[PDB]
């Protein structure tokens, strides 16, 4: 028996949404434009008086005006009526002075009469001097102020569905299986959802319970709170997501909790996310993961934990970022122990004056007591508006082989640093930190560079040493 009944409701809420906040907003720019206009007039002022200086002595005194005068250009447009869209166009008059060359004159245009609020007629009054008289003076005080655009500042009906209940139940009868899944949804004003699935069977794996709630309001922010829970013998899930919008501040809480029920692999993790943000945005992320491997047939097992913690501080003053994670793991494979772990720490501080970055890394892993000691994978660098410093990776490698004659191996560098400042340049590089071993005395190296520069002051030291079997060579170079 399958149910899909649905009570149709075409009615909807029409929430009025104001737009006048936008309507005044651009209008605010207009007022600035208004004063900007008089600034333009000031620029025009810097010419107008001078232009007056070029008019009188050419027109008022010299006989060069009032010769074959013409009627001033006056163009009239009668108003019109449009009943379909109901628009009244007022008569419009355009005036140019006849004297000169189509020089603009005083223009004045009011607003028209239309239907609704779609466009705005540019009603203004600009006054400009006429060349028919020698006196030219643009009124700086008289500016041009256009009316603000009224593009439906209060007319807007956001449509919100006013719905019934979405009903869908699935029920089936048999002799070995019994499923009764019910899904319902409430849509009258807000978002209220819940799912229920009931499974009954002879087999334990086929019999379980699934349920979940989902709520989302709209009246006061979009506050969501969805939690899930699975009742199964093999999957035990508890997922918790709540997003709260209190119309002033947002909150996110993700409590993810699920565990595995596999006999040969006991995995158990955990996820928590709280993106809290009230005054300064911040991130609280810490990822948790545990696992348990055991293979009797393959005589292998693995047991470790992997975790991370993320810290973020979006502070208005500075921004410091914190991250670290651990990849710990242990195991035994064919009567041979397995090890290996990871440690991370990347500290990166930023500022408008100085920045620092140091990366600390740990990868000490061994394969059955072999090839280990990978330590000190750190490097640091600092940049200031007075000094620069860098010391990059200078790790060490010292590993042991358990097959043969206990062969030792590993080659690495020493510290090697760069120092920068006005009048002081330093390059102090010691490198070639090798490890001699068996098989005819593996070479032992080493190299030192001392560069010290203060413009003309130049100290250069270069030392090298090489060791092979039953011999050696060393060389030095010095510039003072």
């Amino acid at each position: 028996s399958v149910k899909a009944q649905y009570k149709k409701n075409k009615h909807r809420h029409s929430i009025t949404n104001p737009l006048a906040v936008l309507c005044e907003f651009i209008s605010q720019s207009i007022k600035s434009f208004d004063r900007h206009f008089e600034k333009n007039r000031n620029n025009a002022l810097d010419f107008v008086t001078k232009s007056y200086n070029e008019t009188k002595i050419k027109f008022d005194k010299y006989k060069a005006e009032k010769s074959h005068d013409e009627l001033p250009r006056t163009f009239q447009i009668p108003g019109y009526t449009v009943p379909v869209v109901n628009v009244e166009v007022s008569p419009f008059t355009i005036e140019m002075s006849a004297f000169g060359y189509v020089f603009p004159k005083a223009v004045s245009m009011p607003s028209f009469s239309i239907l609704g609020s779609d466009v705005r007629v540019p009603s203004y009054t600009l006054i400009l001097p006429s060349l028919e008289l020698p006196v030219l003076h643009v009124p700086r005080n008289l500016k041009l102020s256009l009316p603000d655009f009224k593009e439906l500042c209060t007319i807007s009906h956001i449509f919100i569905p006013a719905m019934g209940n979405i009903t869908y139940d699935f029920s089936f009868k048999s002799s070995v299986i019994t499923l009764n899944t019910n899904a319902e949804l409430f849509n009258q004003s807000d978002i209220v959802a819940h799912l229920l699935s009931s499974s009954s069977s002879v087999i334990d794996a086929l019999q379980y319970k699934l349920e979940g709630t989902t709520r989302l309001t709209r009246k006061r922010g979009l506050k969501l709170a969805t939690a899930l829970s699975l009742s199964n013998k093999f999957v035990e899930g508890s997922h918790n997501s709540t997003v709260s919008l209190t119309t002033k501040n947002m909150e996110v809480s993700v409590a993810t909790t699920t565990k595995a029920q596999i006999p040969i692999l006991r995995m158990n993790f955990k996820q928590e996310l709280n993106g809290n943000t009230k005054s300064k945005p911040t991130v609280s992320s810490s990822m948790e993961f545990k696992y348990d491997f055991n293979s009797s047939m393959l005589y292998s097992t693995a047991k470790g934990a992997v975790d991370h913690k993320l810290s973020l501080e979006s502070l208005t003053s500075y921004f410091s970022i914190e991250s670290s994670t651990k990849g710990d793991v242990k195991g035994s494979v064919l009567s041979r122990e397995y090890s290996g772990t990871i440690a991370s720490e990347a500290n990166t501080y930023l500022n408008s004056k100085s920045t620092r970055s140091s990366v600390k890394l740990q990868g000490t892993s061994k394969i059955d007591d072999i090839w280990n000691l990978e330590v000190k994978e750190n490097f640091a660098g600092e940049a200031t508006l007075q000094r620069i410093y860098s010391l990059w990776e200078h790790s060490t490698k010292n590993h042991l082989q358990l097959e043969g004659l206990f062969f030792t191996n590993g080659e690495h560098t020493s510290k090697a640093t760069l120092e920068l400042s006005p009048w002081q340049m330093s390059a102090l590089v010691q490198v070639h930190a090798s490890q001699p071993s068996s098989f005819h005395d593996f070479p032992d190296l080493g190299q030192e560079v001392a560069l010290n520069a203060n413009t003309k002051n130049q100290k250069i030291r270069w030392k090298n040493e090489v060791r092979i079997h039953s011999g050696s060579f060393q060389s030095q170079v010095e510039l003072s």
Binding site: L22, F25, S27, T316, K456
Partner: protein
């Protein structure tokens, strides 16, 4: 800003050094998504 005739220790050539001292540029407080206004139009981000 100072100007001085000097003789460097690691440079046998005398020079003239013009030095602008340290400056502390002042960056006044400002507001972020509450109500922005750049001298042209007041924009209320909270209202929108």
């Amino acid at each position: 800003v100072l100007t001085k005739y000097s003789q460097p220790e690691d440079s046998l050539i005398p020079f003239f050094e013009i030095t602008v001292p340290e400056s502390q540029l002042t960056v006044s407080q400002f507001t972020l998504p509450k109500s922005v206004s750049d001298g042209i139009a007041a924009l209320d981000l909270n209202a929108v």
